[PDB]
Amino acid sequence: HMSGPRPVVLSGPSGAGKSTLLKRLLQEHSGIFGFSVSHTTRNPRPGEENGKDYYFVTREVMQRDIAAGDFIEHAEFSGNLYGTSKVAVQAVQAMNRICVLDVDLQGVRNIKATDLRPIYISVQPPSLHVLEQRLRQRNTETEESLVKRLAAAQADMESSKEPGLFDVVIINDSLDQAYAELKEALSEEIKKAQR
Numbered sequence: 001h002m003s004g005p006r007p008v009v010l011s012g013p014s015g016a017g018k019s020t021l022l023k024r025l026l027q028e029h030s031g032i033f034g035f036s037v038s039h040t041t042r043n044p045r046p047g048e049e050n051g052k053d054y055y056f057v058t059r060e061v062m063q064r065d066i067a068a069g070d071f072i073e074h075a076e077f078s079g080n081l082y083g084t085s086k087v088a089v090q091a092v093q094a095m096n097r098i099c100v101l102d103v104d105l106q107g108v109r110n111i112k113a114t115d116l117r118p119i120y121i122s123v124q125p126p127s128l129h130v131l132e133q134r135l136r137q138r139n140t141e142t143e144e145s146l147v148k149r150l151a152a153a154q155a156d157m158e159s160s161k162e163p164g165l166f167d168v169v170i171i172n173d174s175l176d177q178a179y180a181e182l183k184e185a186l187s188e189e190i191k192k193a194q195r
C-alpha cells in the first residue's frame with residue numbers, strides 16, 4: 001500500500017535513543033503519527049507491552065508467518081529475529097497516519113528495496129562509550145548480546161556516513177536537542193498532516 005503520508009524510518013545502534021525519541025513523538029503528535037509494531041523473537045523487557053512495543057512471538061510462529069509471505073522485511077539481530085509485517089504498516093496507513101518504523105541497518109537496506117519511499121533518519125550516540133554506558137545502565141541484555149550489540153553499533157555507526165543512505169543524522173547527546181532535531185526533520189510533513 002502506498003496510500004497515506006510518507007513513512008519515517010528511524011535507525012541507529014542499540015541504545016542510541018530510538019525508542020525514547022519515538023515515544024516522545026507519539027505522545028506529542030499522537031494524532032498524526034502511528035507506530036509500526038514489529039514482530040520479534042526476543043524476550044520482552046520489564047515495561048514492554050505485547051502489541052505496543054513488539055509482537056513478542058516464538059521462532060516457530062515467526063517462521064510460519066515468514067513462510068506465508070506476511071512480512072515486508074525481516075532480519076536477524078544479536079541472536080533474535082525481527083520483522084515488519086505487512087499488516088503492521090497497513091494498519092497505520094489505513095488510519096491516514098504517518099507510519100514510523102524503528103529498524104536496524106539491515107532493515108533500512110531492506111526497506112530501500114520496497115515501494116515505501118520513506119525518510120530515513122539515523123539516531124547516533126555521542127560516542128561508543130556513552131552508548132555502552134547507556135546500554136549497561138539498563139542491563140536488559142546478557143553480556144553475550146551486549147557484546148554483539150556493541151559490535152553491531154560500531155559496524156552500523158560507520159555506515160551512517162554512507163552518502164545517500166540517511167536523509168538526516170541526529171546525535172543524541174541531549175534528549176531535548178535530539179527531539180527538536182527529529183521534529184525539524186519532519187516539520188514539513190507535520191505541518192501538512194495538521195492542515
Ligand SMILES: Nc1ncnc2c1ncn2[C@@H]1O[C@H](COP(=O)(O)OP(=O)(O)O)[C@@H](O)[C@H]1O
Nearest residue numbers: 014015016017018019020134138172173174175
Ligand atoms: N539524551 C540522553 N542522555 C542520556 N541517556 C539517554 C538519552 N537518551 C536515551 N537515554 C537512555 O539510553 C537508554 C537507551 O535508550 P533507548 O531509547 O532504549 O535506545 P534504543 O531504543 O535506541 O535501543 C535508555 O535507558 C534511555 O533512558
Ligand SMILES: Nc1nc2c(ncn2[C@@H]2O[C@H](COP(=O)(O)O)[C@@H](O)[C@H]2O)c(=O)[nH]1
Nearest residue numbers: 038074075077082083084102103104106107
Ligand atoms: N530489520 C528490522 N529491525 C528491527 C525491527 N524491529 C526492531 N528492529 C531493530 O532491532 C534492533 C534491536 O532492537 P531491540 O532488541 O533493542 O528492541 C534495533 O536496531 C531495532 O531497530 C524490524 O522490524 N526489522
Ligand code: ALF
Nearest residue numbers: 013014015018019
Ligand atoms: F532499539 Al534498541 F537496544 F532498544 F537497539
Ligand SMILES: [Mg+2]
Nearest residue numbers: 015018019020
Ligand atoms: Mg529500543
